Design a protein around this ligand. Sequence first.
Ligand code: MG
Ligand code: MG
Ligand code: MG
Ligand code: MG
Ligand code: MG
Ligand code: MG
Ligand code: MG
Ligand code: MG
Ligand code: MG
Ligand code: MG
Ligand code: MG
Ligand code: MG
Ligand code: MG
Ligand code: MG
Ligand code: MG
Ligand code: MG
Ligand code: MG
Ligand code: MG
Ligand code: MG
Ligand code: MG
Ligand code: MG
Ligand code: MG
Ligand code: MG
Ligand code: MG
Ligand code: MG
Ligand code: MG
Ligand code: MG
Ligand code: MG
Ligand code: MG
Ligand code: MG
Ligand code: MG
Ligand code: MG
Ligand code: MG
Ligand code: MG
Ligand code: MG
Ligand code: MG
Ligand code: MG
Ligand code: MG
Ligand code: MG
Ligand code: MG
Ligand code: MG
Ligand code: MG
Ligand code: MG
Ligand code: MG
Ligand code: MG
Ligand code: MG
Ligand code: MG
Ligand code: MG
Ligand code: MG
Ligand code: MG
Ligand code: MG
Ligand code: MG
Ligand code: MG
Ligand code: MG
Ligand code: MG
Ligand code: MG
Ligand code: MG
Ligand code: MG
Ligand code: MG
Ligand code: MG
Ligand code: MG
Ligand code: MG
Ligand code: MG
Ligand code: MG
Ligand code: MG
Ligand code: MG
Ligand code: MG
Ligand code: MG
Ligand code: MG
Ligand code: MG
Ligand code: MG
Ligand code: MG
Ligand code: MG
Ligand code: MG
Ligand code: MG
Ligand code: MG
Ligand code: MG
Ligand code: MG
Ligand code: MG
Ligand code: MG
Ligand code: MG
Ligand code: MG
Ligand code: MG
Ligand code: MG
Ligand code: MG
Ligand code: MG
Ligand code: MG
Ligand code: MG
Ligand code: MG
Ligand code: MG
Ligand code: MG
Ligand code: MG
Ligand code: MG
Ligand code: MG
Ligand code: MG
Ligand code: MG
Ligand code: MG
Ligand code: MG
Ligand code: MG
Ligand code: MG
Ligand code: MG
Ligand code: MG
Ligand code: MG
Ligand code: MG
Ligand code: MG
Ligand code: MG
Ligand code: MG
Ligand code: MG
Ligand code: MG
Ligand code: MG
Ligand code: MG
Ligand code: MG
Ligand code: MG
Ligand code: MG
Ligand code: MG
Ligand code: MG
Ligand code: MG
Ligand code: MG
Ligand code: MG
Ligand code: MG
Ligand code: MG
Ligand code: MG
Ligand code: MG
Ligand code: MG
Ligand code: MG
Ligand code: MG
Ligand code: MG
Ligand code: MG
Ligand code: MG
Ligand code: MG
Ligand code: MG
Ligand code: MG
Ligand code: MG
Ligand code: MG
Ligand code: MG
Ligand code: MG
Ligand code: MG
Ligand code: MG
Ligand code: MG
Ligand code: MG
Ligand code: MG
Ligand code: MG
Ligand code: MG
Ligand code: MG
Ligand code: MG
Length: 272
Amino acid sequence: AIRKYKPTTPGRRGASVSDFAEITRSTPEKSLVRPLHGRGGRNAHGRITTRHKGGGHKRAYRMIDFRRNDKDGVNAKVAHIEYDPNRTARIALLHYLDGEKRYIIAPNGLSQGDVVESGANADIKPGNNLPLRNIPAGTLIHAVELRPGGGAKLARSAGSSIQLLGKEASYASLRMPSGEIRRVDVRCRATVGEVGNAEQANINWGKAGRMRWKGKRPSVRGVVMNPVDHPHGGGEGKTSGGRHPVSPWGKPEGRTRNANKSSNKFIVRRRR
RNA sequence: GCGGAGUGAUCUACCCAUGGCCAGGGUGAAGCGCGGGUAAGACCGCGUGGAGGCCCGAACCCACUUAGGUUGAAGACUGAG
RNA sequence: GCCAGGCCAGUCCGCCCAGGGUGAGUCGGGACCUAAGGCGAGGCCGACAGGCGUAGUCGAUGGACAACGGGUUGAUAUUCCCGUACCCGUGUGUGGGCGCCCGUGACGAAUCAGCGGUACUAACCACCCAAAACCGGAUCGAUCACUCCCCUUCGGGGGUGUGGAGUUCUGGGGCUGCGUGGGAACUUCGCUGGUAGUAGUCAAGCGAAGGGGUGACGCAGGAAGGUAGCCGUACCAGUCAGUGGUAACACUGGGGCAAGCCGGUAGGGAGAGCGAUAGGCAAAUCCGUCGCUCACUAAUCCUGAGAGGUGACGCAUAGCCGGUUGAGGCGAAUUCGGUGAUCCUCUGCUGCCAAGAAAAGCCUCUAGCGAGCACACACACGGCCCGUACCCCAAACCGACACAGGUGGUCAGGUAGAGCAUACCAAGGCGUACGAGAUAACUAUGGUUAAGGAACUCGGCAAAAUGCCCCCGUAACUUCGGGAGAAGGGGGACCGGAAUAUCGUGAACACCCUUGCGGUGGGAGCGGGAUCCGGUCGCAGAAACCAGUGAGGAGCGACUGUUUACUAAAAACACAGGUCCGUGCGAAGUCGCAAGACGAUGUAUACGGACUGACGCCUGCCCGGUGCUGGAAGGUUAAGAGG
RNA sequence: AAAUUCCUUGUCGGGUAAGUUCCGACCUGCACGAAUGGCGUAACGACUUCUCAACUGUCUCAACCAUAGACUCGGCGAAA
RNA sequence: UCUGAUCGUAUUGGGCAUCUAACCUCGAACCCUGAAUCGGGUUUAGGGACAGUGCCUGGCGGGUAGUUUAACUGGGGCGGU
RNA sequence: CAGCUUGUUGGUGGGGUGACGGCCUACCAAGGCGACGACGGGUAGCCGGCCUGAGAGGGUGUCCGGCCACACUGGGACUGA
RNA sequence: ACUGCAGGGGAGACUGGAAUUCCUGGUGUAGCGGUGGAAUGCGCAGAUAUCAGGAGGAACACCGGUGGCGAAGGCGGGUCUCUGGGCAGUAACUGACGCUGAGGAGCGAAAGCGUGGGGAGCGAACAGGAUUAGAUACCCUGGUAGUCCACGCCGUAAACGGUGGGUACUAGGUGUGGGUUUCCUUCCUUGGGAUCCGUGCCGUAGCUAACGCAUUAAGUACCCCGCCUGGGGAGUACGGCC
RNA sequence: CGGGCCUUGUACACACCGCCCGUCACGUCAUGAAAGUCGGUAACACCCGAAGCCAGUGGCCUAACCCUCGGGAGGGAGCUGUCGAAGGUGGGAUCGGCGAUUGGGACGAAGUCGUAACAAGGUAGCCGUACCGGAAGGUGCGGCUGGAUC
RNA sequence: CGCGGGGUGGAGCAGCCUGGUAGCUCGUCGGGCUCAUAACCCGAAGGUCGUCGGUUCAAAUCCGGCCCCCGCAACCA
Ligand SMILES: [Mg+2]
Ligand SMILES: [Mg+2]
Ligand SMILES: [Mg+2]
Ligand SMILES: [Mg+2]
Ligand SMILES: [Mg+2]
Ligand SMILES: [Mg+2]
Ligand SMILES: [Mg+2]
Ligand SMILES: [Mg+2]
Ligand SMILES: [Mg+2]
Ligand SMILES: [Mg+2]
Ligand SMILES: [Mg+2]
Ligand SMILES: [Mg+2]
Ligand SMILES: [Mg+2]
Ligand SMILES: [Mg+2]
Ligand SMILES: [Mg+2]
Ligand SMILES: [Mg+2]
Ligand SMILES: [Mg+2]
Ligand SMILES: [Mg+2]
Ligand SMILES: [Mg+2]
Ligand SMILES: [Mg+2]
Ligand SMILES: [Mg+2]
Ligand SMILES: [Mg+2]
Ligand SMILES: [Mg+2]
Ligand SMILES: [Mg+2]
Ligand SMILES: [Mg+2]
Ligand SMILES: [Mg+2]
Ligand SMILES: [Mg+2]
Ligand SMILES: [Mg+2]
Ligand SMILES: [Mg+2]
Ligand SMILES: [Mg+2]
Ligand SMILES: [Mg+2]
Ligand SMILES: [Mg+2]
Ligand SMILES: [Mg+2]
Ligand SMILES: [Mg+2]
Ligand SMILES: [Mg+2]
Ligand SMILES: [Mg+2]
Ligand SMILES: [Mg+2]
Ligand SMILES: [Mg+2]
Ligand SMILES: [Mg+2]
Ligand SMILES: [Mg+2]
Ligand SMILES: [Mg+2]
Ligand SMILES: [Mg+2]
Ligand SMILES: [Mg+2]
Ligand SMILES: [Mg+2]
Ligand SMILES: [Mg+2]
Ligand SMILES: [Mg+2]
Ligand SMILES: [Mg+2]
Ligand SMILES: [Mg+2]
Ligand SMILES: [Mg+2]
Ligand SMILES: [Mg+2]
Ligand SMILES: [Mg+2]
Ligand SMILES: [Mg+2]
Ligand SMILES: [Mg+2]
Ligand SMILES: [Mg+2]
Ligand SMILES: [Mg+2]
Ligand SMILES: [Mg+2]
Ligand SMILES: [Mg+2]
Ligand SMILES: [Mg+2]
Ligand SMILES: [Mg+2]
Ligand SMILES: [Mg+2]
Ligand SMILES: [Mg+2]
Ligand SMILES: [Mg+2]
Ligand SMILES: [Mg+2]
Ligand SMILES: [Mg+2]
Ligand SMILES: [Mg+2]
Ligand SMILES: [Mg+2]
Ligand SMILES: [Mg+2]
Ligand SMILES: [Mg+2]
Ligand SMILES: [Mg+2]
Ligand SMILES: [Mg+2]
Ligand SMILES: [Mg+2]
Ligand SMILES: [Mg+2]
Ligand SMILES: [Mg+2]
Ligand SMILES: [Mg+2]
Ligand SMILES: [Mg+2]
Ligand SMILES: [Mg+2]
Ligand SMILES: [Mg+2]
Ligand SMILES: [Mg+2]
Ligand SMILES: [Mg+2]
Ligand SMILES: [Mg+2]
Ligand SMILES: [Mg+2]
Ligand SMILES: [Mg+2]
Ligand SMILES: [Mg+2]
Ligand SMILES: [Mg+2]
Ligand SMILES: [Mg+2]
Ligand SMILES: [Mg+2]
Ligand SMILES: [Mg+2]
Ligand SMILES: [Mg+2]
Ligand SMILES: [Mg+2]
Ligand SMILES: [Mg+2]
Ligand SMILES: [Mg+2]
Ligand SMILES: [Mg+2]
Ligand SMILES: [Mg+2]
Ligand SMILES: [Mg+2]
Ligand SMILES: [Mg+2]
Ligand SMILES: [Mg+2]
Ligand SMILES: [Mg+2]
Ligand SMILES: [Mg+2]
Ligand SMILES: [Mg+2]
Ligand SMILES: [Mg+2]
Ligand SMILES: [Mg+2]
Ligand SMILES: [Mg+2]
Ligand SMILES: [Mg+2]
Ligand SMILES: [Mg+2]
Ligand SMILES: [Mg+2]
Ligand SMILES: [Mg+2]
Ligand SMILES: [Mg+2]
Ligand SMILES: [Mg+2]
Ligand SMILES: [Mg+2]
Ligand SMILES: [Mg+2]
Ligand SMILES: [Mg+2]
Ligand SMILES: [Mg+2]
Ligand SMILES: [Mg+2]
Ligand SMILES: [Mg+2]
Ligand SMILES: [Mg+2]
Ligand SMILES: [Mg+2]
Ligand SMILES: [Mg+2]
Ligand SMILES: [Mg+2]
Ligand SMILES: [Mg+2]
Ligand SMILES: [Mg+2]
Ligand SMILES: [Mg+2]
Ligand SMILES: [Mg+2]
Ligand SMILES: [Mg+2]
Ligand SMILES: [Mg+2]
Ligand SMILES: [Mg+2]
Ligand SMILES: [Mg+2]
Ligand SMILES: [Mg+2]
Ligand SMILES: [Mg+2]
Ligand SMILES: [Mg+2]
Ligand SMILES: [Mg+2]
Ligand SMILES: [Mg+2]
Ligand SMILES: [Mg+2]
Ligand SMILES: [Mg+2]
Ligand SMILES: [Mg+2]
Ligand SMILES: [Mg+2]
Ligand SMILES: [Mg+2]
Ligand SMILES: [Mg+2]
Ligand SMILES: [Mg+2]
Ligand SMILES: [Mg+2]
Ligand SMILES: [Mg+2]
Ligand SMILES: [Mg+2]
Ligand SMILES: [Mg+2]
Ligand SMILES: [Mg+2]
Ligand SMILES: [Mg+2]
Ligand SMILES: [Mg+2]
């Protein structure tokens, strides 16, 4: 699934790339495409709020359907598996029997041509979308909602899944990819299966220019700055920072979650 | 030098949208064909193909060395590399 | 014009004075469209000042949209004039065509009477249970009343059999009900006659709200087919350049012309009918989706460079006449090849990953409007605002200067050459603003140098050297790609011959045919390249200009990259790779008092921060100190409560 | 004995006619040391450093030629 | 009768649990709306007297700010005073 | 010591020799040798014989006899049966 | 070839329960743990113990053996899917198609290596305690890689029967696994006999230096292959291949 | 503590007051690596190329043969060309010697440190592998009996 | 050179600013245990407290002077 380049140049020695063997129809669906423009990590004030962003190839947004609420009982057929520059997972184009086109995140094992169902009366097969009440415990799911009707938020990256632990009264227990136990309403929805393209994390980008294409600008270590620029700056030779490590704005390392956040009631165990 | 209120990104730093430009040579990746090899394979030899922060080299962009300039042709340049 | 300016002078001038000079339906912009971004009705937020933003409206560097060739002035010309085109709108005629009322064809319901659903379901049936109650068996316990038996301190145990409230298991009736499915009607449904072909609808044209399609998009790489251009050439018109030859093809010049329209080639691209319809907020014959029949190699349609015709009975031109050297008049031939694009077919094709605007415009669908419309020809008209002179790699711009600096795009000839390098030239420009002399030292910029050859110097700094095409040949080491143009060598000019198809490109005259912009053979003329053999010349054949020095051992950084504009380009920064910490989602983090924003139209294989810095082998011990993470037994500790 | 070693031109070997630099070692580490990473490493470098071939006015040791100044004449005509 | 432990009313305080109606929701639908991912209102789905905010109060706080950091001295620094 | 070979392997026409022959040459074809050890490295004149041994074997090549090679080192031809 | 037969032979997918550890909650109070004896350690902030619920990984008690299958290494929770070999019977078919096998290729315990995941228990390294003259150990308390999974590499073991493969022949006795088979066919006995293929013990001839082997040869013979030539140096250096 | 009988293991027989392993220190011998350095051998590519054969040319010389008496034929000297030994240049291959320093090996006396193996050798031992440790070795995983147990 | 720390039994270390009494481990000697040696056990012994010169009734101790040893600094041109 990962193809390795031959060491023809210094910049392709250890590099690797997807084989793109799951991809059909290398062009997108014209009516589901909206424009994007880069922002260079600049907010509404025009200032850099996120460093190390900018440059990179031009992209077009593809409308992914994260609700899957209005087509319960209407079946769909997978037409194409396509490339998507906005996420690590591939996306599937669905032809609903009523004649509507939609993108969903392609699960693992959703070859072109398979049929896909939604609603409480759907089989437990990869690509089906059900309320959590209807999914048996011990099942791998993805694209889970945090609130009923809020859209899929959890387990959308490539290779991700959520393991449904159990349903007690009106709450389901989930083990999320980070490994922490959360509790959600059983009226939330999820798609059955694991997100595909699970091998993409083994890609070795060979050179700096390849990351510039994906839109990351170079990152300067704070220890080779001047004291005016970073708390780690200064020194005659090279140093380790003359103090305990801190952020560029002087914040020390440590937990940054709000201690009295309103969602603590839904967190069973913090990640390890 | 300190404070208050304003002016500046037509220079320069970075970013955003939209256009344009890069003579001529060389090398020969993946893939794909053919033949060999086998039970099938790996693998091998040829073709095709034209990859690459690839090579030599004008425009173009730089500024490493040296000589000249140093009340300059020029408040940072010229010649030769 | 000449007293300032111009680095001298000046009769000249980008200087000074007066007058004149810029002509657009089509060029570049607006009146058309939107991108990043700006402003922003209400709005939200903010003590005030104000911040941000929705609807909206601006905003090209992009999209859409109609003109070419010649002539003319001292100064403008795709603008004026001539010839020939194209685009939008207006009016008036002529002609046929389709419409409404009319009429007219197509479609076409609706009420009330005949059966099942047994759909509905009072009851009923099948099933299990409380199978209620109750009749009543067995199991357990220290109660317990009767009778058989016993000790005593006189109150009860045991032998306790029976039952009593009896625990439990559990036998039968299982009425009454639970539940399911069959399951009475009226009530909902459909069929036939049936209101009746009745009500009603549709059938000119426009539709711009709204739906849909298109518009609509990356980078790299060619090939094939063409054309511009360029070089020859039939043919035409001329020359004798006072030199040894040269009298006509020996030499010189010409050997032309657009948009538009016609045309449909090379090359590309495309299934069509019928039905149904949850979707495209309403609707839809459109789009989407599904199904059937046929075709599926084809036919047909679209598209499309080029060739060809017209444009052109015109314009232009070599030259010749007359010629204040100004304006004028006449004006020949114009065929066939080669080479060849950065241009065109091509918004195509192939490959790749990094996955490559929007809106208008155009087309279509219906909502709707609708009694008059659409069409052909002819004629006559309307085509608005701004720019247009001149410089524009510069003496007219940015540099205080008529300043060796800087300034985006388009075009771009010949011979040699791989080439937009380089040399010399064409078209066309220019000699640019102090000069004239003179063999001083010395400085600068170039050139040559006997013998030696780094002895110079901090240091081979600078210079010298190598350098091209073709052919042999090429090491350690290696991450198997490299190193490598390693190193080191050999050939190179001209003439003749092989050589008349030597070979390879294109392919004229002449050979068939589904007759065409067709095919096959054919090989002319015109160009390309290499070899072998023989000869000739010089000191030298890469000929001038142009054009790698190579090898070896260490250190640092893996590598390409970036940096102190103006003394530091590096061993510094970055980098792919690694590890740790944080973050469960208007997340963490950052900008903001806040709202709001970015993160991200992302979701732990993700994002932020920290350190290390390709790859290989590895990364040992210490938790005492200070941080970080967790905990809460104890000690100390604020306001508040208490008083 | 190091981009780290003061003593110090440590000592031994190699290279040179002669080597405070260079290469290989020794360990007596003033004061190396494992992600402020340790030790290596093919390729790469207008990096630093040492050696060789070729070549040369860098040098022994200079000489000559041409041009722009300098110098002379006419014009204009500053500066610290 | 320290009455230590215990009774029933008060009264209020402290946890603890539940509720919904304040309040919250960048969950959803509809309307203002003709064009609206803003805003507001209506309904619903949740959370919930918590959170957020005001006043008071303790901690932490080179993130930022204002400042201080002696003199003598056979120059100053180090030493000493 | 695992790949060696381009007059190399074969053919045709010529040349050359006392004689066949890539012995030589022009052209044509693409063969030839190799694990039964090609190519390479080490050593060595070979034999009748001699020494040993029950024999088979092992060692050896000196006197004598046969053959080969050479004549200071390398190359070349001439004269001649 | 047909018909039967036995089997932890192999691969994949799903799935079960006991137990250990941890987490949550209840009860509960001062010890637990460990040894030759102790200490380190855990706990009093509520441990060990006990009860209920949950998570997760690994190994599969009884069956179970001396027994089975596989070329060897190896193979046992269950079910399903796919798949290899063996034996017996028949004698239907082919008609010597056989054996061995230099080089070569494939498979090949464990440890180890790479990339990714997982991690209960165990446990190199490491730390503390104890013992000891010392204790880089044995014993104790912890504990990382690893052990597990996917996909590759590695190619070695006292990889052993310390016994290469094929074939024929040479007393028996006695167990056990898989068939077939008359007769005694009920003597129900699933006993006896006969025959074929395994796997053990004991024993004659024969062999052996002896120990022992002995129809499963280390006996009697034939075919092919590998290997040995005193002990060290040394399965090491150099060269090469991976 | 000592003794007796039987049985078991043994690498002991000077008979456990036995045998025996590995570092370290001193000495000797042989050998591997090493910046580099000194020799030998056989080739290869190219440059230059003597003699000589062969092939050409050959105005200079030439008795026999021919002649029309001028010469002709034929020959030679010289010259050119292929091949060509020796030599030169270059990059490799291969066989040895030395080499500061460094790795192990063997043998030495009556040196130092432990006690790994042989008995259940005092923790059964060996095999493969990995990590660790002054050293014999230890520990983990798997294996074997060439060990024990009822 | 400046500054601050040290010198105690054969060796490694306490005791010292507190002036009145020098101790611990290993070592050494003798005795046990052993065939003998280690290891183990028992009993002992051993010191001008770097020198000198001061305060003091009294100094290892307090203070100055020299001697060795160690550590930290010797900087700006
Ligand atoms: Mg702003
Ligand atoms: Mg970042
Ligand atoms: Mg960085
Ligand atoms: Mg810095
Ligand atoms: Mg700054
Ligand atoms: Mg700071
Ligand atoms: Mg710092
Ligand atoms: Mg620093
Ligand atoms: Mg430092
Ligand atoms: Mg660090
Ligand atoms: Mg100011
Ligand atoms: Mg501003
Ligand atoms: Mg190029
Ligand atoms: Mg290929
Ligand atoms: Mg490049
Ligand atoms: Mg270049
Ligand atoms: Mg430029
Ligand atoms: Mg720069
Ligand atoms: Mg200079
Ligand atoms: Mg000067
Ligand atoms: Mg310069
Ligand atoms: Mg330059
Ligand atoms: Mg004047
Ligand atoms: Mg003047
Ligand atoms: Mg307002
Ligand atoms: Mg605004
Ligand atoms: Mg806007
Ligand atoms: Mg506009
Ligand atoms: Mg524009
Ligand atoms: Mg003009
Ligand atoms: Mg006109
Ligand atoms: Mg698009
Ligand atoms: Mg072409
Ligand atoms: Mg003449
Ligand atoms: Mg002509
Ligand atoms: Mg349709
Ligand atoms: Mg035409
Ligand atoms: Mg104009
Ligand atoms: Mg003009
Ligand atoms: Mg202009
Ligand atoms: Mg100017
Ligand atoms: Mg200028
Ligand atoms: Mg040119
Ligand atoms: Mg040029
Ligand atoms: Mg010129
Ligand atoms: Mg003069
Ligand atoms: Mg010279
Ligand atoms: Mg010379
Ligand atoms: Mg030199
Ligand atoms: Mg010198
Ligand atoms: Mg000198
Ligand atoms: Mg130089
Ligand atoms: Mg030069
Ligand atoms: Mg070369
Ligand atoms: Mg090289
Ligand atoms: Mg000559
Ligand atoms: Mg070159
Ligand atoms: Mg080194
Ligand atoms: Mg150095
Ligand atoms: Mg670098
Ligand atoms: Mg490194
Ligand atoms: Mg480069
Ligand atoms: Mg600078
Ligand atoms: Mg540089
Ligand atoms: Mg510089
Ligand atoms: Mg930097
Ligand atoms: Mg936040
Ligand atoms: Mg993490
Ligand atoms: Mg960190
Ligand atoms: Mg770094
Ligand atoms: Mg990084
Ligand atoms: Mg580093
Ligand atoms: Mg570390
Ligand atoms: Mg610590
Ligand atoms: Mg700590
Ligand atoms: Mg701690
Ligand atoms: Mg804390
Ligand atoms: Mg050293
Ligand atoms: Mg150092
Ligand atoms: Mg030195
Ligand atoms: Mg030198
Ligand atoms: Mg030097
Ligand atoms: Mg050195
Ligand atoms: Mg360091
Ligand atoms: Mg570190
Ligand atoms: Mg290093
Ligand atoms: Mg660079
Ligand atoms: Mg550099
Ligand atoms: Mg003068
Ligand atoms: Mg509150
Ligand atoms: Mg509060
Ligand atoms: Mg602070
Ligand atoms: Mg401050
Ligand atoms: Mg102040
Ligand atoms: Mg002072
Ligand atoms: Mg002083
Ligand atoms: Mg030949
Ligand atoms: Mg022949
Ligand atoms: Mg010999
Ligand atoms: Mg014999
Ligand atoms: Mg000879
Ligand atoms: Mg002699
Ligand atoms: Mg000779
Ligand atoms: Mg004779
Ligand atoms: Mg002869
Ligand atoms: Mg498996
Ligand atoms: Mg656990
Ligand atoms: Mg508990
Ligand atoms: Mg418990
Ligand atoms: Mg037969
Ligand atoms: Mg075999
Ligand atoms: Mg074999
Ligand atoms: Mg294998
Ligand atoms: Mg393993
Ligand atoms: Mg592993
Ligand atoms: Mg490891
Ligand atoms: Mg792993
Ligand atoms: Mg354990
Ligand atoms: Mg342990
Ligand atoms: Mg320990
Ligand atoms: Mg073996
Ligand atoms: Mg085994
Ligand atoms: Mg063996
Ligand atoms: Mg056998
Ligand atoms: Mg046998
Ligand atoms: Mg048997
Ligand atoms: Mg024997
Ligand atoms: Mg036996
Ligand atoms: Mg035997
Ligand atoms: Mg070995
Ligand atoms: Mg080796
Ligand atoms: Mg007796
Ligand atoms: Mg014995
Ligand atoms: Mg020795
Ligand atoms: Mg050696
Ligand atoms: Mg000759
Ligand atoms: Mg040596
Ligand atoms: Mg042992
Ligand atoms: Mg022992
Ligand atoms: Mg022991
Ligand atoms: Mg033992
Ligand atoms: Mg250990
Ligand atoms: Mg072991
Ligand atoms: Mg074991
Ligand atoms: Mg300094």
